[PDB]
Design an enzyme around this catalytic site. Structure first.
Site, short mmCIF file in Angstrom:
data_model
loop_
_atom_site.label_atom_id
_atom_site.label_comp_id
_atom_site.label_asym_id
_atom_site.label_seq_id
_atom_site.Cartn_x
_atom_site.Cartn_y
_atom_site.Cartn_z
N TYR A 23 -25.43 -30.27 121.03
CA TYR A 23 -24.13 -30.51 120.37
C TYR A 23 -23.67 -29.28 119.56
O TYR A 23 -22.47 -29.11 119.31
CB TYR A 23 -24.15 -31.76 119.50
CG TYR A 23 -24.67 -31.60 118.07
CD1 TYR A 23 -26.00 -31.74 117.78
CD2 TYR A 23 -23.80 -31.33 117.01
CE1 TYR A 23 -26.48 -31.61 116.47
CE2 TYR A 23 -24.26 -31.23 115.70
CZ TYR A 23 -25.62 -31.36 115.44
OH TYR A 23 -26.12 -31.25 114.14
N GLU A 186 -38.73 -34.24 109.85
CA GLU A 186 -38.42 -35.60 110.34
C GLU A 186 -39.47 -36.27 111.25
O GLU A 186 -39.15 -36.74 112.35
CB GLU A 186 -37.04 -35.62 111.02
CG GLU A 186 -35.88 -35.33 110.03
CD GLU A 186 -34.48 -35.52 110.59
OE1 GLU A 186 -34.38 -35.83 111.80
OE2 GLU A 186 -33.48 -35.33 109.83
N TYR A 249 -27.48 -38.86 105.91
CA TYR A 249 -26.28 -38.99 106.77
C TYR A 249 -25.77 -40.42 106.80
O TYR A 249 -26.51 -41.37 106.51
CB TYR A 249 -26.60 -38.58 108.19
CG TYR A 249 -27.06 -37.15 108.39
CD1 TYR A 249 -26.18 -36.08 108.27
CD2 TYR A 249 -28.38 -36.87 108.72
CE1 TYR A 249 -26.62 -34.78 108.49
CE2 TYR A 249 -28.83 -35.56 108.94
CZ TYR A 249 -27.93 -34.53 108.86
OH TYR A 249 -28.39 -33.27 109.10
N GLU A 286 -30.90 -31.65 104.42
CA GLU A 286 -29.86 -31.85 105.42
C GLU A 286 -28.86 -32.89 104.99
O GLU A 286 -29.23 -33.93 104.48
CB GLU A 286 -30.40 -32.27 106.79
CG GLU A 286 -31.31 -31.29 107.45
CD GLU A 286 -31.69 -31.67 108.89
OE1 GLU A 286 -31.00 -32.52 109.49
OE2 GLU A 286 -32.69 -31.14 109.38
#
Length: 394
Positions: A23, A186, A249, A286
């Site tokens: 992406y 992660e 997020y 992040e």
């Protein structure tokens, strides 16, 4: 080379550089599409390098490594008032498994980047972003849809790679630039054995310190609840210079995507309140400006967006097409984005600081610090507020 009690991290990730993410650099993957058919597009770096073979992979990657990020980027980062970069790198930069398709060469550019950082008064974390067999099944580990980090000898290979990183970058040579080594990006807690993951973190901690290194150890939170790590690697037990990395997020599920802007902001503020209660130094390693999952291939190659009901049985919320180009955004979406960015900045500055994902993308504006800054959506200077005190911290 950093005061985690008094200083605040204001940084960006250098994503898409040493670990390919479709992406972020879709141009490297799109040549494999057959018209509108994406069924033959390699889904990750593992399959991308395998499909190309060693010679073509290395030619294409050398050009990528030498152009995606350069010294000029580091100048711009410093000019924008940032003080820090996080650098993702995969295990394959250091060691290949038998039959691995990966190519090497990244370390040359890693070391140039450390010099560019020094020259521009920027501090760094080195982040082991991909472990053998994959620690999460995400395409950003190198290997999608596989969860074999704890199988066979993969954990031991990962520790051997970390030992190499410890000896090269955890010593006196880089003690003015490197302010953390992140043991593993992660690890997907819910599918792993948490006892074995803790043992791995402890082995890495002890291994680094035994080299004589004083470098901080950064542990990712493994998607655990706030405070889960409060009792692990503690000063009480003689374990010191430890930082927890939280990623935040609101785009990974339908429930998150359907929240109104005020509720998005409330969730962001609460990240701040809850991180403040924790007993370790902690940094938002992040986060982004994204309120949608519309970026092409964000969920993976050949997967659509939950936002427009095109993936994972998600209901339709809105059309992605209008949101792919920042010049086409409504005034309302721009205002919502600015509010969301400012709320996150306040929340993350309430503890150790923040590291935006990422510095740049080819064409995904929600995920590009550069694009958001040039379009007036990311505060510049970063202390500027059009929506002051949304959270009411004290």
């Amino acid at each position: 080379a950093w005061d985690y009690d008094n200083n605040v991290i204001r940084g960006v990730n250098l994503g898409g550089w040493f670990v390919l993410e479709p992406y972020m650099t879709p141009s490297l993957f799109e040549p494999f599409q057959n018209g509108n058919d994406q069924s033959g597009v390699p889904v990750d770096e593992y399959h991308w390098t395998q499909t190309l073979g060693k010679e073509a992979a290395l030619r294409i990657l050398q050009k990528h490594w030498s152009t995606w990020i350069t010294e000029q980027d580091f100048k711009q980062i410093s000019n924008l008032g940032l003080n820090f970069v996080r650098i993702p790198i995969g295990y394959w930069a250091f060691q290949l498994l038998d039959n691995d398709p990966y190519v090497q060469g990244q370390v040359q550019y890693l070391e140039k980047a450390l010099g560019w950082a020094r020259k521009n008064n920027i501090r760094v974390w080195i982040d082991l972003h991909g472990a053998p067999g994959s620690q999460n099944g995400f395409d950003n580990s190198g290997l999608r849809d596989s969860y074999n980090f704890q199988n066979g000898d993969n954990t031991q290979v990962t520790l051997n790679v970390l030992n190499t990183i410890f000896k090269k970058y955890g010593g006196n040579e880089y003690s003015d630039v490197v302010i953390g080594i992140e043991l593993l990006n992660e690890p997907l807690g819910p599918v792993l054995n948490m006892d074995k993951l803790k043992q791995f973190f402890l082995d890495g901690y002890n291994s680094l310190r035994q080299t004589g290194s004083v470098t901080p150890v950064i542990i990712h939170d493994a998607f655990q609840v706030f405070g889960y790590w409060n009792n692990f690697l503690t000063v009480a037990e003689g374990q010191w210079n430890v930082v927890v990395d939280h990623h935040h997020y609101q785009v990974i599920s339908g429930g998150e995507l359907s929240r109104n802007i005020n509720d998005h902001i409330s969730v962001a503020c609460n990240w701040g309140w809850d991180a403040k209660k924790e007993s370790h130094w902690n940094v938002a390693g992040e986060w982004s400006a994204a309120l949608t999952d519309c970026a092409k291939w964000l969920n993976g190659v050949n997967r659509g967006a939950r936002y427009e009901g095109a993936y994972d049985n998600a209901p339709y919320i809105g059309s992605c097409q209008p949101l792919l180009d920042i010049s086409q955004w409504s005034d309302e979406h721009k205002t919502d984005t600015r509010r969301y960015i400012e709320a996150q900045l306040d929340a993350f500055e309430y503890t150790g600081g923040w590291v935006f994902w990422s510095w740049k993308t080819e064409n995904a504006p929600e995920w590009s610090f550069q694009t958001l800054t040039y379009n007036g959506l990311f505060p510049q200077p970063v202390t500027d507020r059009q929506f002051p005190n949304q959270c009411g911290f004290h």
